[model samples]
Target: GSFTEGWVRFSPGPNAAAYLTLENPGDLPLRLVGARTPVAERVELHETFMREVEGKKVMGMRPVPFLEVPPKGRVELKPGGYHFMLLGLKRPLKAGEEVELDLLFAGGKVLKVVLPVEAR
Candidate 1:
């Protein structure tokens, strides 16, 4: 399995978020089971969606079981969408610093990526 166009974004707080484009150029679907990062205490997979209640915008985040990337298909992790949640940061991640991430797949497969911090 191979990946490209992977990147992450850092929020302005103790918590930071990450986004990436997961492309499965193989013949089988790839399932993303979990993730990890040394820069934070724990990293989890998150999915975001929107809802309207009482004329107010309601945003939600939840744990995802597995992200599926179909054959020749791509899964995008974007703002307000599917992303990585980095909690209990070891230190404040400044812009221009490179952050490393380890994405775990269901079948003991791991994808490592280094993404530069970008502005929100």
Candidate 2:
């Protein structure tokens, strides 16, 4: 199991988001439990949800329990989709810097990735 195209967005606020591509080349499906970073106080799996606000569509985000990458398949975490929400950042993330992100999965599997900060 490996991840590709991993990066974190630079944010002036207290929170930030990360996106990546996950590829599973095994017989068993992998369950991504969550992630961690020294830059943020906590990390959580998040997804975008749409609802009605004043008769107009509004988007919201929330934490998810788990994200599954099927066997021999792939999943892309992109904007307005499933992403890692970094909360309570210890310091503001700046573009052109890199951070260490540890991907935690079920069944005791972990992957360490270096996500470069970028502005998008």
**Candidate No. with top TM-score:** 2
Q: What C-alpha lDDT do the candidate models reach, one value each?
A: 0.79, 0.84
Residues 1-120 of candidate 1: C-alpha lDDT, one tens digit per residue: 145665657665677777787887789889998788767777888899888999998999887877778888987887668888887887676778887888888886999888887857
lDDT of candidate 2 over 1-120, digit per residue (tens): 155888888677687788888878899899998888878887899888888979999997888998998899999886788898887888876679898988989987998988788876
Model 1, CA-based lDDT: 0.79
Q: Judging by lDDT against the true structure, name the best candidate.
A: 2
The lDDT, on a scale of 0 to 1, for candidate 2 is: 0.84
Clashes of each: 0, 0
